Amino acid sequence: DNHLSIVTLEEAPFVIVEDIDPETCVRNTVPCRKFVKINNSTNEGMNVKKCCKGFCIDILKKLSRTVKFTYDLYLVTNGKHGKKVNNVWNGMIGEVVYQRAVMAVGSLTINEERSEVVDFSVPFVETGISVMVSRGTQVTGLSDKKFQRPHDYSPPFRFGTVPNGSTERNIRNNYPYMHQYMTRFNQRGVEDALVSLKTGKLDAFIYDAAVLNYKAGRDEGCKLVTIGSGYIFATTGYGIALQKGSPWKRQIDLALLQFVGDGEMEELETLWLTGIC
Amino acid sequence: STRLKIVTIHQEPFVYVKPTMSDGTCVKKVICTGPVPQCCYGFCIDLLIKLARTMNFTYEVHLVADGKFGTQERVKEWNGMMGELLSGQADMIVAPLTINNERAQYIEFSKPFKYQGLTILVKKGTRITGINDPRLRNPSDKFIYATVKQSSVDIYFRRQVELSTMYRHMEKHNYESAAEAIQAVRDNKLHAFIWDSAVLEFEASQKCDLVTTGELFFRSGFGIGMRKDSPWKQNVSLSILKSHENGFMEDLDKTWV
Ligand SMILES: Cc1ncc(CNC(=O)c2cnc(CNS(=O)(=O)c3ccc(F)c(Cl)c3)cn2)s1
Ligand SMILES: N[C@@H](CCC(=O)O)C(=O)O
Structure with missing residues (x-):
């Protein structure tokens, strides 16, 4: 043993x-x-x-x-x-x-x-849970209304996560309407989400805070940022x-x-x- | 079969300490006995009240006798809140108690209810780069800095022989409580206060004559103090983890911090 x-x-x-x-x-x-x-x-x-x-x-x-x-x-x-x-x-x-x-x-x-x-x-x-954008946002975070009630805009914000993790498990328990809205923007991995952000197909990526802070610190040109200048939920x-x-x-x-x-x-x-x- | 004995320490914004009115009574306030019935409230008190229903137990709050957090000094014995928990005077430490190696060897920490770190508080107008400033690394009695006696920051500066001199200059200037050291910086005879950021920067946000510098030079967290055999550890940690996820610890951070 x-x-x-x-x-x-x-x-x-x-x-x-x-x-x-x-x-x-x-x-x-x-x-x-x-x-x-x-x-x-x-x-x-x-x-x-x-x-x-x-x-x-x-x-x-x-x-x-x-x-x-x-x-x-x-x-x-x-x-x-x-x-x-x-x-x-x-x-x-x-x-x-x-x-x-x-x-x-x-x-x-x-x-x-x-x-x-x-x-x-x-x-x-x-x-924890952080938000990554690229770039030019005024959203406060996950409790920002645009994630809570997306369709109150024309168009709504396009934000997603990588499912089956601790991040999606938390948003499903806390925000039922936000969770069922993110399902169409679910990314297969972290690399696919970053590509979607820089190509304009995704507006925000909600994921583990530690990984996002790492990827943001190694971005070519310092364009990926976590909002709140590093704010962490849960x-x-x-x-x-x-x-x-x-x-x-x-x-x-x-x-x-x-x-x-x-x-x-x-x-x-x-x-x-x-x-x- | 018994009420849980809760030991707490005066440390705003986590725990306020106020005197009872003439009627003997005092936001969520609980009667706390301290060196005398007093009034306690704040972050750690709301968290204790949230723990007391989730688990359904009654409690009695009383402040620590010697007014310290807890260190192990040779006669080896623990002072502060650590000694009262190990001796039986306490069944649970609900306070901004820092989780480190020496304390965890004797007591059982829950999962951290507050993630933060160490910073430096100074009088606004005094400039130091950070923990590696020459006025702290190679100290002189011209620049006076210290921390709190019998605290986790005191343990941090003494358990490494490289920080032996940063510790000795503080060894003569350390204070009995954080409140004394913070106002001593305002009176301009304490030039720098090395304490946890959750307390320092918060008071810098209420007293616009002091500023925290260097950001965090070391990370540390706060956990609930329990003995090795407390049968609440499994449920205290689960309640803290649940309190982090449901955005409810975030409510306390906006309410008090
Ligand atoms: C992104 C990174 N974060 C941390 C890294 C390196 N490890 C630490 O700093 C660290 C510090 N203290 C402890 C034990 N006390 S604790 O209260 O449980 C605690 C406090 C603050 C923390 F940040 C973490 Cl994680 C845990 C554990 N780990 S790298
Ligand atoms: N670190 C997460 C996976 C990534 C995420 O969900 O943010 C977990 O252990 O479940």
């Missing part, structure tokens, strides 16, 4: 996956496998061996040293971060719920409905999702809290989230 099964999900700059040397994972990368199907009828597949790096990856390494545990790393393939579908959890959350991963590492937002099924560590990356953070009652809950937080007072979270903050804009 000194060796743990750990699940992760790719989302720059926290978890970045690159193809391996056609032999080992070099530099600051850690070996991480990904179950890839053979075809779309058989359940048969193969674990392709890749290399993972980023903010949450080094966080895993620092905790791997201080807490003294070995691990294998694997990318989630049934979903992404996690969503309760027909009272069944998928994604990284589902991997911990059904005892296929001892802990989950990555840009895993801590919300209330997940803490009912898993145990979250201390938030080590502040995040403030929370990324957290290591563990089993409910996990005996590893006692050091991960104490060692993460150590990383804060030590001055090591600052390094990875200036290592991976240093912004040009």
Whole structure:
């Protein structure tokens, strides 16, 4: 039990996956496998061996040293971060719920409905829900009327999100009319949403605050901005999702809290989230 | 089977402290016993009241005796609110208590109900670049800066040997409470106050003679204080997480902060 099964999900700059040397994972990368199907009828597949790096990856390494545990790393393939579908959890959350991963590492937002099924560590990356535009807006935020009641304009505002995450889960519970309006503007990923913003097809992109602040700081020409100059709704953070009652809950937080007072979270903050804009 | 004993500390805008009227009574106000029945209200009090129904429990608020947050000093014992929670005088710390490593080793923090950080408060007209200003890095008794005694900021400057000198100049100038240090900056004998931004910049928004500088040089958060065995931890954290999502913590931030 000194060796743990750990699940992760790719989302720059926290978890970045690159193809391996056609032999080992070099530099600051850690070996991480990904179950890839053979075809779309058989359940048969193969674990392709890749290399993972980023903010949450080094966080895993620092905790791997201080807490003294070995691990294998694997990318989630049934979903992404996690969503309760027909009272069944998928994604990284589902991997911990059904005892296929001892802990989950990555840009895993801590919300209330997940803490009912898993145990979250201390938030080590502040995040939430922010709005990204490009550019020239006077909207206050999500509580701005234009998101609340879109059709009170002719034309209404065209804003969307990437579904099945903690962001869409929050807007559905809080704003029923806004949520059913955003469904036509749902983006398949963060890269598609940025393209839609700069091409004029999308007016605003509602997503995780930490990722938006990262993408806004690395924009060519400093055109993507988060409104409020960085305002965040439903403030929370990324957290290591563990089993409910996990005996590893006692050091991960104490060692993460150590990383804060030590001055090591600052390094990875200036290592991976240093912004040009 | 018993009322929960709530320990709080005077720290506006989170917790105000006012005296009872001649009738013995006092927005949502709760009678708090402090060094004497007093009146307490604010951010942390509304949050305590919101916790008390979500969980359906009765409580009694009383201020901390020594008037401190809590640090571990050698005779090792905890002072401030930390000691009262560990000794049994308290069952729950509802206050702007900073979550750090040393405190979490003994008590159980809930998920943070307030995300913020550390900044520097100065008298408007005094210019320092930030925490890395030469008047703070290489200090002199010409420029006086300090923090609050027996606080989390005091722990932050002493647990790193590189910050050993920034700490020693403060070691002689630290104050017993934040309120004394803030007005001391107005009287121009405290030149800089290093404290949490949730308190400093808010008071800079009400007293237009002080200004916060350098923005945040270190991030920290506020969590509910509980012992290792409090059977409310699971539900306190869930209530805080739910309070963050439903835009309700945001209501308190506009109401008080
Ligand atoms: C975008 C980024 N945010 C944070 C990064 C690096 N880590 C921290 O600053 C940090 C600081 N303190 C703690 C523990 N206390 S806490 O109250 O739980 C808390 C306070 C403020 C925070 F911001 C977060 Cl996340 C959590 C954890 N983490 S990088
Ligand atoms: N970080 C989110 C995914 C992105 C989002 O929904 O904003 C989660 O863990 O669910």
